[PDB]
Design a binder for this molecule. Structure first.
Ligand SMILES: OC[C@H]1O[C@H](O[C@H]2[C@@H](O)[C@H](O)[C@@H](CO)O[C@@H]2O)[C@@H](O)[C@@H](O)[C@@H]1O
Ligand SMILES: OC[C@H]1NC[C@@H](O)[C@@H](O[C@H]2O[C@H](CO)[C@@H](O)[C@H](O)[C@H]2O)[C@@H]1O
Length: 348
């Protein structure tokens, strides 16, 4: 009873797409295309970020440098950072890449997590031609391949998946997978799981979707307050009330800030400034105050979107002057997370 234990109802969104030239053949994701402006006309030549030491695809700079997500020693350090933050579940981005380098990374992550008693669940992304049939096939593959790993997450005996952009699939399709009567149901099978869909817009649209698709719960993802109805924290009390009334699990997503203008220069309206951690505090406070049973954190290391709690350091190159953690130390967002985990556990 030290107040330092991992919390297993706290989920931190984790990305394993970073590479080094040495380990992966390229500085993967540190190099990144610059997205054209959706409202910016037809002849755009936006360019790319080369992913050199001076110029990486983030408005911030990692304390660990241009790391490889395949590097066992980087993984060990990340797991130690999870321990520091008291975040007991790593929610791994999963893009269905069906290649051996990804299979290797997933094994390394599970192994490194287990050494620190961290758990892993999968964040199922909108991969090409994703539909309920191949989703089932991939759920089967993941549970079969990893269900016996000691680090594989379970809640009251069930695996848990977050489904990004779930709303892109019709409720009549979801019901085949998620209804107890569905033609390809996972309910009452070896592959049953808590399915947590992405709540985006207004209750008028989202309430029937969640009910008719038979999702077990919902999350909101976006670190930038106000980006969607779901990511507007003043809605969370109301959202929790509905969740409780309808037997659903609400897992609001909290983040320390947002900025993606290195890769999306036209997207400045979505910037949310960290102000020495006050933004993080405000958002985490709203989640706890809503009376939820679980909280998700956006993100551990989505460096592109500037939502990361992973330690960042001050850096000025000839190419760019990076943002940093201002008056706070590089590990401030890890220790502040630990602080909020404590408060969460206090009132659970
Ligand atoms: O405009 C860039 C925007 O893209 C991403 O969000 C998109 C999508 O995933 C979401 O489902 C909807 C919800 O309204 O919005 C976009 O279409 C995110 O990367 C976001 O942070 C970013 O601003
Ligand atoms: O994990 C859910 C959701 N979060 C924000 C992004 O990480 C998004 O993925 C895409 O955008 C990133 C850059 O922010 C890009 O590098 C990646 O290729 C896209 O998939 C993700 O689905």
């Amino acid at each position: 009873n030290l107040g330092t234990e991992l919390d297993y109802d706290t989920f931190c969104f984790y990305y394993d797409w970073y590479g080094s030239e040495a380990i992966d053949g390229q500085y993967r994701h540190w190099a990144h295309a610059i997205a054209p402006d959706p409202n910016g006309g037809s002849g755009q030549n936006p360019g790319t970020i080369p992913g050199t030491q001076e110029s990486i695809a983030s408005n911030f700079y990692p304390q660990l440098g241009r790391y490889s997500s395949s590097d066992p020693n980087i993984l060990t350090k990340h797991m130690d950072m999870f321990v520091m933050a008291r975040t007991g579940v790593l929610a791994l981005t999963w893009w269905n890449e069906q290649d051996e380098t990804e299979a290797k990374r997933i094994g390394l992550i599970l192994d490194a997590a287990d050494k620190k008693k961290i758990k892993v669940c999968f964040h199922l992304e909108p991969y090409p031609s994703r539909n309920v049939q191949n989703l089932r096939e991939n759920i089967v593959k993941l549970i079969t391949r990893y269900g016996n790993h000691p680090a594989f997450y379970r809640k009251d005996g069930k695996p848990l998946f977050f489904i990004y952009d779930s709303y892109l699939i019709e409720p009549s399709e979801w019901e085949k997978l998620l209804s107890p009567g569905g033609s390809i149901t996972i309910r009452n099978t070896a592959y049953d799981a808590l399915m947590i869909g992405l709540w985006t817009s207004s209750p008028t649209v989202q309430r029937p979707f969640i009910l008719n698709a038979h999702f077990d719960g919902f999350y909101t993802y976006f670190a930038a307050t106000g980006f969607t109805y779901g990511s507007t924290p003043t809605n969370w009390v109301s959202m929790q009330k509905w969740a409780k009334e309808n037997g659903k699990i609400f897992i609001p997503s909290v983040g320390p800030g947002y900025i993606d203008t290195r890769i999306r220069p036209w997207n400045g309206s979505v910037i949310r400034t960290r102000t020495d951690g006050q933004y993080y505090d405000a958002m985490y406070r709203k989640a706890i105050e809503a009376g939820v049973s679980a909280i998700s954190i956006t993100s551990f290391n989505e460096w592109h979107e500037g939502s990361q709690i992973e330690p960042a350091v001050p850096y000025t190159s000839s190419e760019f002057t990076y943002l940093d953690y201002e008056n706070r130390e590089p590990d401030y967002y890890l220790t502040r997370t630990a602080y909020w985990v404590g408060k969460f556990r206090e009132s659970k």
